[PDB]
Write a protein that holds these residues in place. Structure first.
Motif, PDB file in Angstrom:
ATOM      1  N   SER A 195     126.084  -7.979 -14.638  1.00  0.00           N
ATOM      2  CA  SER A 195     125.544  -9.256 -15.078  1.00  0.00           C
ATOM      3  C   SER A 195     126.682 -10.239 -15.293  1.00  0.00           C
ATOM      4  CB  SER A 195     124.743  -9.092 -16.371  1.00  0.00           C
ATOM      5  OG  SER A 195     124.387 -10.349 -16.910  1.00  0.00           O
ATOM      6  N   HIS A 196     126.598 -11.398 -14.636  1.00  0.00           N
ATOM      7  CA  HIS A 196     127.506 -12.516 -14.893  1.00  0.00           C
ATOM      8  C   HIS A 196     126.659 -13.777 -15.038  1.00  0.00           C
ATOM      9  CE1 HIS A 196     130.646  -9.690 -13.692  1.00  0.00           C
ATOM     10  NE2 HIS A 196     129.934  -9.457 -12.604  1.00  0.00           N
ATOM     11  N   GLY A 197     126.115 -13.986 -16.236  1.00  0.00           N
ATOM     12  CA  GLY A 197     125.305 -15.150 -16.514  1.00  0.00           C
ATOM     13  C   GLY A 197     126.134 -16.305 -17.034  1.00  0.00           C
ATOM     14  N   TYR A 198     125.452 -17.426 -17.272  1.00  0.00           N
ATOM     15  CA  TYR A 198     126.148 -18.613 -17.754  1.00  0.00           C
ATOM     16  C   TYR A 198     126.747 -18.386 -19.134  1.00  0.00           C
ATOM     17  CZ  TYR A 198     127.266 -23.559 -17.509  1.00  0.00           C
ATOM     18  OH  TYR A 198     127.930 -24.760 -17.426  1.00  0.00           O
ATOM     19  N   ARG A 199     126.018 -17.706 -20.017  1.00  0.00           N
ATOM     20  CA  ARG A 199     126.500 -17.402 -21.357  1.00  0.00           C
ATOM     21  C   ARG A 199     126.839 -15.923 -21.509  1.00  0.00           C
ATOM     22  NH1 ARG A 199     123.559 -20.121 -26.393  1.00  0.00           N
ATOM     23  NH2 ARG A 199     124.775 -18.342 -27.160  1.00  0.00           N
ATOM     24  N   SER A 200     127.229 -15.286 -20.409  1.00  0.00           N
ATOM     25  CA  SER A 200     127.660 -13.897 -20.445  1.00  0.00           C
ATOM     26  C   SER A 200     128.919 -13.750 -21.289  1.00  0.00           C
ATOM     27  CB  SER A 200     127.918 -13.387 -19.026  1.00  0.00           C
ATOM     28  OG  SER A 200     127.931 -11.971 -18.983  1.00  0.00           O
ATOM     29  N   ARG A 201     129.010 -12.617 -21.987  1.00  0.00           N
ATOM     30  CA  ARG A 201     130.115 -12.272 -22.891  1.00  0.00           C
ATOM     31  C   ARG A 201     130.582 -13.472 -23.715  1.00  0.00           C
ATOM     32  NH1 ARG A 201     133.848 -11.160 -17.475  1.00  0.00           N
ATOM     33  NH2 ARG A 201     132.061  -9.884 -16.836  1.00  0.00           N
ATOM     34  N   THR A 202     129.620 -14.132 -24.367  1.00  0.00           N
ATOM     35  CA  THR A 202     129.889 -15.189 -25.338  1.00  0.00           C
ATOM     36  C   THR A 202     129.274 -14.857 -26.693  1.00  0.00           C
ATOM     37  OG1 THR A 202     127.935 -16.510 -24.794  1.00  0.00           O
ATOM     38  CG2 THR A 202     129.922 -16.884 -23.491  1.00  0.00           C
ATOM     39  N   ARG A 203     129.150 -13.566 -27.002  1.00  0.00           N
ATOM     40  CA  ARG A 203     128.411 -13.149 -28.189  1.00  0.00           C
ATOM     41  C   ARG A 203     129.063 -13.667 -29.467  1.00  0.00           C
ATOM     42  NH1 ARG A 203     126.789  -6.980 -29.827  1.00  0.00           N
ATOM     43  NH2 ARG A 203     126.395  -7.385 -32.044  1.00  0.00           N
ATOM     44  N   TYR A 204     130.386 -13.558 -29.564  1.00  0.00           N
ATOM     45  CA  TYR A 204     131.105 -14.042 -30.736  1.00  0.00           C
ATOM     46  C   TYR A 204     131.649 -15.447 -30.558  1.00  0.00           C
ATOM     47  CZ  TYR A 204     130.952  -9.101 -31.810  1.00  0.00           C
ATOM     48  OH  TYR A 204     130.529  -7.816 -32.051  1.00  0.00           O
ATOM     49  N   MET A 205     131.794 -15.904 -29.315  1.00  0.00           N
ATOM     50  CA  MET A 205     132.374 -17.215 -29.062  1.00  0.00           C
ATOM     51  C   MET A 205     131.498 -18.324 -29.629  1.00  0.00           C
ATOM     52  SD  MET A 205     133.610 -18.700 -25.405  1.00  0.00           S
ATOM     53  CE  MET A 205     134.015 -16.989 -25.085  1.00  0.00           C
ATOM     54  N   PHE A 206     130.203 -18.283 -29.333  1.00  0.00           N
ATOM     55  CA  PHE A 206     129.274 -19.310 -29.782  1.00  0.00           C
ATOM     56  C   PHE A 206     128.628 -18.971 -31.114  1.00  0.00           C
ATOM     57  CE2 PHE A 206     128.439 -20.625 -25.104  1.00  0.00           C
ATOM     58  CZ  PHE A 206     129.727 -21.123 -25.048  1.00  0.00           C
ATOM     59  N   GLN A 207     128.955 -17.817 -31.690  1.00  0.00           N
ATOM     60  CA  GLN A 207     128.532 -17.509 -33.046  1.00  0.00           C
ATOM     61  C   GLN A 207     129.002 -18.612 -33.979  1.00  0.00           C
ATOM     62  OE1 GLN A 207     128.397 -12.851 -33.351  1.00  0.00           O
ATOM     63  NE2 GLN A 207     129.467 -13.666 -35.149  1.00  0.00           N
ATOM     64  N   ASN A 257     129.379 -25.927 -30.128  1.00  0.00           N
ATOM     65  CA  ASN A 257     128.504 -25.644 -31.254  1.00  0.00           C
ATOM     66  C   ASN A 257     127.367 -24.763 -30.756  1.00  0.00           C
ATOM     67  OD1 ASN A 257     126.809 -25.725 -33.563  1.00  0.00           O
ATOM     68  ND2 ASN A 257     127.607 -27.749 -34.106  1.00  0.00           N
ATOM     69  N   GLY A 258     127.315 -23.522 -31.242  1.00  0.00           N
ATOM     70  CA  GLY A 258     126.259 -22.621 -30.815  1.00  0.00           C
ATOM     71  C   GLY A 258     124.881 -23.082 -31.248  1.00  0.00           C
ATOM     72  N   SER A 259     124.815 -23.906 -32.297  1.00  0.00           N
ATOM     73  CA  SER A 259     123.532 -24.387 -32.794  1.00  0.00           C
ATOM     74  C   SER A 259     122.885 -25.380 -31.837  1.00  0.00           C
ATOM     75  CB  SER A 259     123.710 -25.021 -34.172  1.00  0.00           C
ATOM     76  OG  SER A 259     122.802 -26.090 -34.364  1.00  0.00           O
ATOM     77  N   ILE A 260     123.676 -26.238 -31.200  1.00  0.00           N
ATOM     78  CA  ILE A 260     123.163 -27.218 -30.249  1.00  0.00           C
ATOM     79  C   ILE A 260     123.325 -26.631 -28.853  1.00  0.00           C
ATOM     80  CG2 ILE A 260     123.930 -29.298 -29.048  1.00  0.00           C
ATOM     81  CD1 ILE A 260     123.347 -29.015 -32.844  1.00  0.00           C
ATOM     82  N   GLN A 261     122.217 -26.525 -28.123  1.00  0.00           N
ATOM     83  CA  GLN A 261     122.203 -25.849 -26.835  1.00  0.00           C
ATOM     84  C   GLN A 261     122.200 -26.802 -25.649  1.00  0.00           C
ATOM     85  OE1 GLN A 261     119.494 -23.886 -28.987  1.00  0.00           O
ATOM     86  NE2 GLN A 261     121.351 -22.816 -29.652  1.00  0.00           N
ATOM     87  N   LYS A 262     122.018 -28.097 -25.880  1.00  0.00           N
ATOM     88  CA  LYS A 262     122.047 -29.078 -24.806  1.00  0.00           C
ATOM     89  C   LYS A 262     123.460 -29.612 -24.632  1.00  0.00           C
ATOM     90  CE  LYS A 262     117.458 -30.939 -24.031  1.00  0.00           C
ATOM     91  NZ  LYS A 262     116.175 -30.665 -24.731  1.00  0.00           N
ATOM     92  N   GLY A 263     123.857 -29.816 -23.379  1.00  0.00           N
ATOM     93  CA  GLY A 263     125.202 -30.277 -23.093  1.00  0.00           C
ATOM     94  C   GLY A 263     126.279 -29.331 -23.567  1.00  0.00           C
ATOM     95  N   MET A 264     125.990 -28.037 -23.598  1.00  0.00           N
ATOM     96  CA  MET A 264     126.966 -27.068 -24.070  1.00  0.00           C
ATOM     97  C   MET A 264     127.995 -26.779 -22.980  1.00  0.00           C
ATOM     98  SD  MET A 264     125.941 -23.804 -26.429  1.00  0.00           S
ATOM     99  CE  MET A 264     124.986 -23.229 -25.028  1.00  0.00           C
ATOM    100  N   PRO A 265     129.277 -26.735 -23.329  1.00  0.00           N
ATOM    101  CA  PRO A 265     130.297 -26.378 -22.344  1.00  0.00           C
ATOM    102  C   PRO A 265     130.228 -24.903 -21.987  1.00  0.00           C
ATOM    103  CG  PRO A 265     131.288 -26.583 -24.500  1.00  0.00           C
ATOM    104  CD  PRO A 265     129.860 -27.024 -24.649  1.00  0.00           C
ATOM    105  N   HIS A 266     130.855 -24.574 -20.864  1.00  0.00           N
ATOM    106  CA  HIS A 266     130.950 -23.188 -20.449  1.00  0.00           C
ATOM    107  C   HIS A 266     132.018 -22.458 -21.264  1.00  0.00           C
ATOM    108  CE1 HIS A 266     131.499 -19.811 -17.439  1.00  0.00           C
ATOM    109  NE2 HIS A 266     130.184 -19.879 -17.549  1.00  0.00           N
TER     110      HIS A 266
END
Lengths: 159, 191, 111, 171
Positions: free
Chosen positions: A3-15, A44-53
RNA sequence: CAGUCAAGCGUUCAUAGCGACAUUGCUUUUUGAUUCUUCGAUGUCGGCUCUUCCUAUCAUACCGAAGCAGAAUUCGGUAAGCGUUGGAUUGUUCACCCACUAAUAGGGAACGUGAGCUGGGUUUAGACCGUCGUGAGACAGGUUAGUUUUACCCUACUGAUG
RNA sequence: GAGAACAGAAAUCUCCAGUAGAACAAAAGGGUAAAAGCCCCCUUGAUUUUGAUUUUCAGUGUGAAUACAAACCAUGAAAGU
RNA sequence: GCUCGUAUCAGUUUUAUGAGGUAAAGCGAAUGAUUAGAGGUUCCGGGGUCGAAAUGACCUUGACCUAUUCUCAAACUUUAAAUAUGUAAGAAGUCCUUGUUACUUAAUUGAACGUGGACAUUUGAAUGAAGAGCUUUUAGUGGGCCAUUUUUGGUAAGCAGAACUGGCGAUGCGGGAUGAACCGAACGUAGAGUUAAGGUGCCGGAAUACACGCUCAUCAGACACCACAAAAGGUGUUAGUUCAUCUAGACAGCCGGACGGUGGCCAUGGAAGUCGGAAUCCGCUAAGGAGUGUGUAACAACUCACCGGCCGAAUGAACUAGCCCUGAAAAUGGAUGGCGCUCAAGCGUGUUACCUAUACUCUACCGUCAGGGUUGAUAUGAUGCCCUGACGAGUAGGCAGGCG
RNA sequence: AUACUGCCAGCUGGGACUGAGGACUGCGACGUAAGUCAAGGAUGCUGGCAUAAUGGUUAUAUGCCGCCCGUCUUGAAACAC
């Protein structure tokens, strides 16, 4: 399989943070960004629009465009054996001003003032920065500071 | 740990003389003369007043300071054999078959003959070392006396008899048969 | 590397013997004050001893003087390295690291 | 090589909040000044919260022996790491100087416990000149009154390969 | 295959003989795992024959120890010097019985040994059966019949001149 | 948790605590409290045109997504979305 | 090749400023595991009582509470590194009644782009830069393998699979005896010197050097990668803590044993001690007990607890780790490389001297690249002649000068 | 006083290898004068031979090295072709 999704392996990054969850404070919205401003990216993990990679998380870029609720950032991304220019449309919640440029502008003003003082007098203002130099000669006295002799300690189990 | 100097005192009675070349000890006295080679020991000797001799090792290890007292005791043994002598008394232990011991001379050599040990038809022959005298002591049944100056040869002859009288293919805890040394003493004891 | 604090003596010997300047991307032996003056006279360095002084008493134009000096091609030490194995630290009985002032002995051996 | 003894005095780097820090001293047996300073920083890092970057060395001095040609007894307290653990040991030796005393102590540790220089801490070297303070029998042995011994079996070195008479080991 | 520790067994008794729960190991005579060599081919299972080697010794020599009275045994040491068979059934290796024996120990040598044999088996093509398959056909399932080539060269070996 | 009458540990439950220990179609992880949850009112932006951009990337495609422009709409008091 | 000519640079540091959730740590912090230990109305697992009846009454897991740290987590975490990583450190820059606009503003307020102005010998850290920006076009390659390191599966593998890297392939040379990869160091042809790694008893160039120890093996040991050994043991030997004392004398052996009132405790088979409980009355002494053991039950029956003479000043117990030994068994004969070596020619350590690579320094010569000089009346077809400085490994492959 | 470090643009020796370049040019040194010199690369003197003596080639001997080329291959001397 893999799996290589857009938010792959970002579990702690966007926390979000510890005890910093929920609604964001309004200074991030009150901050204004102009073209050419240098901005740090921290999603900001709370705001999901316009989120950077997750690649651009922690990257510093230059503003090239300003829109209603977001900003355009120029990032040099290493692709193979060169850098490619990448243009992001990130929201101000993920954008933040970079302080390195601010410190450099303050230094520019300080050099302007020092040069004005040099034009006034001529006392070798020496604008350029220098690295930490080796320490010069100094004399250390022993008034109430007689050297205390230390010795290696014998071994003990302590447990 | 290289003890710098270890020395012992060998006492010399009023009747015996010790002539020691490089490492060849010769003790002479009333009973006879006894000679011992000590070239393997690496020790030194120093006579004091003809009644004591100091045996010394300089800068010796544990295994050298042990051999020093060992040779002091060997010289003790030679002096004691030349003064009083050694007497080894051995008894015959037998349950059924009586041990028949004799002294025989094939080409004049004073072999000791053992017969009927557990009633077998083999005769056990054991030579006698030079200076060892064999005596079938009376006033006690089944006793043999081995007398001499050199305790080494006397005890080795006693051991030779004891070894030739081993029991085989049997439980030696029950078959107590054999000639065993019962006394180790001196020829001129209590004189 | 092996580095340390060079003395006036060892620096002067290094410059006098193995002293080559970088003139128009070319390694030319100093061997005369004329070329040192020609290439470092903007900074007031008009002789080989002027260059030596600028190197030793680290001056405002130390960077220019040092860069003018071509890298010193030293020989192996003539008395050896004094150690069975070089690639341990100087503290560990090796060669590499900071021999604070022993670099003078080492470099005078190699020079 | 030859060990020397250095007194090494160093301090924490003075700050504005605390000028003139406590300026601790050690005695370091080392080959040269560079290793002396390195060992000083090693032990200071072991005791107090300071390192070479966070401190400075204010003095390094060779301590020469007071009477380098007299024979005295030395008690050396050391701490060393074996292949299994850390042990404190106490050994007594005889020399003319402390530096040679520590040199032969290092040789002894290497020979009897395979302890390299790195795994040894010289806790203390104390000079005792009064007997009944010496505890080791291998020193009490040479502490004997009017001691004298021979040297049996002298082996004489020959520069020529061939000798024309059978050698004698008399001495 | 061999150790270490001993809860216990051994009428008492941890260690004569064993020995749980644990744990440390030893060439690969097993079988795996791997796929490095060989697919312009290193002839394959077993047997027969013959030599040699290993020892972790079955017997024989000499010993130590027993819960060794004697006989018979059992546990160990030095020991591979010397031996370790005849047969019924099976192609068998292993098996398993009948016996003899002092004993019928275990293994290696390209799982020794097919220009040494043999060819029973496996392993081409013929054929039958059972199960499977619509069928052609499949089946480390069972049966029956099935070409085993060459040394005169070099070494090695055995003898023979010179 | 203290609670009602059948009625009970698990209906009907008034208060008191309650940082989310719930819920958000589904896997898991993130996210969310006057909400992104639960109710209620309105609704069809799940619309049109074409571009730019991010991810995988060859910086090709496909898929998904991001911020605008010009429109037309919904919702709200509005800011806005 | 092109456009230029030392800068619109850098596998580096520094300063300033971000990002991270791994290592570590933590669990009397959330989640999830996890061991023990006080007190709680039995309407609220299962077991007896004042008795026809339960809140006036106790113990057994802990359901449910008490904040007491026994131990943990790749798919747990408040905290949180090191290494690695984004950006910036200027002339396209920093500051002014302004000028433009249909965007924006309530508004010449903003936004963007500017004209006109002030900034020099330091134009705003360090180091380097054997030139910097690339344009076109095309070869081979698209089986890889091996290190120290991080690491997944597996019991493991000279196994399989991934980490910033360095190598082999593609590469010789010195050393590791031998070896694709290890160490040293990379290669034009020669000469001197010095070295690296490794070595210096002989093979073999080079100290049978110097110095302190340890070790004796009836399978010694002998230097990384690497060509192996373990748990457990050993008064082999060596080196390392406590208790009794030391003028109040410290083990081993040869010889002796013991007092007066005490002779109270089991059936009517037996205790001054042996399958047995209460412990305090007096004693001048160089040695003497209401009591310390092998099965005649009863004084006599074999020892002691303080002990004494002997050419008396340290011993006893446990433990730690160096070498050595046991543990240690495989097949053709056999390999610290061999011979051989024992105060070594072994092991640990420490100066020093010496040996020698295609490495380094310096010279000669060859070629390549580059930066230059050179218009002179004949005797020179100007990359002709000349000054130069640096450099040179190479498979697949490219290109160039030549030879047949 | 000696150690031990450091410096000397301090003195005195003993060996080895090399001698590139070739019509004035330079920088210096020598009581500051014409000149000299160790200063931008060896000259001076002397002897033997003038030949197979040096040297080339060639065969052998000796010391130390040296595996069979081509190929595919991560890896070839290969018991791979």
């Amino acid at each position: 399989g893999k799996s290589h999704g857009y938010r792959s392996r970002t579990r702690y990054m966007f926390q979000r943070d510890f005890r910093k969850h929920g609604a964001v404070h309004l200074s991030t919205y009150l901050k204004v960004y102009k073209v050419g401003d240098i901005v740090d990216i921290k999603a900001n993990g709370s705001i999901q629009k316009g989120m950077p990679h997750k690649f651009y998380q922690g990257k510093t870029g230059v503003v090239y465009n300003v829109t209603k609720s977001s900003v355009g950032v120029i990032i040099n991304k290493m692709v193979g054996n060169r850098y490619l220019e990448k243009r992001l449309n990130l929201r101000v919640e993920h954008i933040k001003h970079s302080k390195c440029r601010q410190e450099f502008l303050e230094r520019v003003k300080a050099n302007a003032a020092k040069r004005a003082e040099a034009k006034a007098q001529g006392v070798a203002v020496q604008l350029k920065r220098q690295p930490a130099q080796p320490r010069e000669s100094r004399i250390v006295s022993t008034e109430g500071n007689v050297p205390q002799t230390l010795a290696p300690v014998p071994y003990e189990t302590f447990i | 740990m290289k003890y710098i100097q270890t020395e012992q005192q060998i006492e010399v009675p009023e009747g015996v003389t010790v002539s020691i070349k490089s490492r060849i000890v010769k003790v002479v006295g009333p009973r006879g003369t006894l000679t011992k080679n000590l070239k393997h020991i690496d020790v030194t000797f120093t006579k004091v007043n003809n009644q004591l001799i100091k045996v010394a090792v300089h800068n010796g290890g544990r295994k050298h300071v042990a051999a020093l007292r060992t040779v002091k005791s060997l010289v003790d043994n030679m002096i004691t054999g030349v003064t009083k002598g050694y007497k080894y008394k051995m008894r015959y232990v037998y349950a059924h078959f009586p041990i028949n011991v004799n002294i025989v001379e094939k080409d004049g050599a004073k072999f000791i003959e053992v017969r009927n040990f557990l009633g077998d038809k083999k005769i056990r022959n054991v030579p006698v070392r030079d200076g060892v005298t064999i005596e079938f002591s009376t006033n006690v049944k089944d006793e043999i006396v081995l007398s001499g100056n050199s305790v080494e040869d006397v005890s080795q002859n006693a051991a030779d008899l004891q070894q030739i009288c081993r029991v085989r293919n049997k439980d030696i805890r029950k078959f107590l048969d054999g000639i065993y040394v019962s006394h180790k003493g001196f020829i001129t004891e209590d004189l | 590397v092996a580095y340390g604090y060079p003395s006036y003596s060892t620096i002067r010997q290094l410059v006098y013997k193995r002293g080559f300047g970088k003139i128009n991307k070319q390694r030319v032996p100093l061997s005369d004050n004329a070329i040192i003056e020609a290439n470092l006279g903007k900074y007031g360095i008009l002789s080989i001893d002027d260059l030596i002084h600028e190197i030793i008493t680290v001056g405002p134009h130390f960077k220019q003087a040092n860069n003018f000096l071509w890298p010193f091609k030293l020989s192996n030490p003539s008395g050896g390295w004094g150690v069975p194995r070089k690639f341990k630290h100087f503290i560990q009985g090796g060669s590499f690291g900071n021999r604070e002032e022993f670099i003078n002995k080492l470099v005078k051996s190699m020079n | 090589a030859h060990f020397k003894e250095y007194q090494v005095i160093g301090r924490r780097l003075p700050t504005e909040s605390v000028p003139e820090p406590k300026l601790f001293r050690m005695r370091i047996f080392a080959s040269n000044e560079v290793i002396a300073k390195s060992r000083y920083w090693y032990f200071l890092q072991k005791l107090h919260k300071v390192k070479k970057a966070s401190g400075e060395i204010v003095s390094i001095n060779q301590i020469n022996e007071a009477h380098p040609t007299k024979v005295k007894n030395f008690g050396v307290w050391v701490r060393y790491d074996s292949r299994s653990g850390t042990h404190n040991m106490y050994k007594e030796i005889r020399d003319v100087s402390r530096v040679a005393a520590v040199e032969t102590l290092y040789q002894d540790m290497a020979a009897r416990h395979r302890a390299r220089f790195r795994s040894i801490h010289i806790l203390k070297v104390a000079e005792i000149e009064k007997t009944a303070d010496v505890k080791r029998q291998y020193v009490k042995q040479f502490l004997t009154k009017d001691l004298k011994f021979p040297l049996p079996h002298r082996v004489q070195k020959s520069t020529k390969t061939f000798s024309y008479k059978r050698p004698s080991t008399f001495y």
